[PDB]
């Protein structure tokens, strides 16, 4: 299904809005600067139905795998243990929901133009990252 666009290793190419997001997230201002000068890379891959978003920087490494679905308990890149879902839309895009602590933040994936680009609203804060396959 769609999942196979997303196949593959990203690599950041901008980055807009990141700073206001990650202070609604609650992350401490070295972790902020560590993430404004950050630019991860991305491996989306999957196999079986298993798949895996690994991001990949000098600062911090990150990893989540999952099923389409199936709901599974996140370690974030700034240490949050989130209950995440993600699925598919007809879009179709790749949406990523997680709660914790009675909060919310919704991250979306499309491919626009062969790049991925990742959106993440938290409380009406937006941030959109854009990655280029490697
Ligand atoms: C992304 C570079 C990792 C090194 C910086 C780690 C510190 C803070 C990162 C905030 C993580 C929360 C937002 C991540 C969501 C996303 O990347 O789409």
Same mark, same amino acid.
């Given at each position: 299904?769609?999942?196979?666009?997303?196949?593959?290793?990203?690599?950041?190419?901008?980055?807009?809005?990141?700073?206001?997001?990650?202070?609604?997230?609650?992350?401490?201002?070295?972790?902020?600067?560590?993430?404004?000068?950050?630019?991860?890379? &991305?491996?989306?891959?999957? #196999? *079986?139905?298993? +798949?895996?978003?690994?991001?990949?920087?000098?600062? $911090? !490494?990150?990893?989540?795998?999952?099923?389409?679905?199936?709901?599974?308990?996140?370690?974030?890149?700034?240490?949050?243990?989130?209950?995440?879902? &993600?699925?598919?839309?007809? #879009? *179709?895009?790749? +949406?990523?929901?997680?709660?914790?602590?009675?909060? $919310? !933040?919704?991250?979306?994936?499309?491919?626009?133009?062969?790049?991925?680009?990742?959106?993440?609203?938290?409380?009406?804060?937006?941030?959109?990252? &854009?990655?280029?396959?490697?």
């Amino acid at each position: 299904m769609a999942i196979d666009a997303f196949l593959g290793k990203w690599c950041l190419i901008s980055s807009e809005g990141f700073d206001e997001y990650m202070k609604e997230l609650g992350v401490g201002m070295a972790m902020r600067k560590m993430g404004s000068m950050a630019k991860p890379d &991305v491996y989306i891959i999957k #196999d *079986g139905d298993t +798949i895996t978003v690994k991001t990949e920087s000098t600062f $911090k !490494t990150s990893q989540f795998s999952f099923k389409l679905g199936e709901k599974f308990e996140e370690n974030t890149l700034d240490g949050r243990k989130t209950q995440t879902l &993600v699925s598919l839309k007809d #879009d *179709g895009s790749l +949406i990523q929901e997680q709660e914790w602590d009675g909060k $919310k !933040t919704i991250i979306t994936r499309k491919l626009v133009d062969g790049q991925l680009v990742v959106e993440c609203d938290m409380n009406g804060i937006k941030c959109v990252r &854009v990655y280029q396959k490697a």
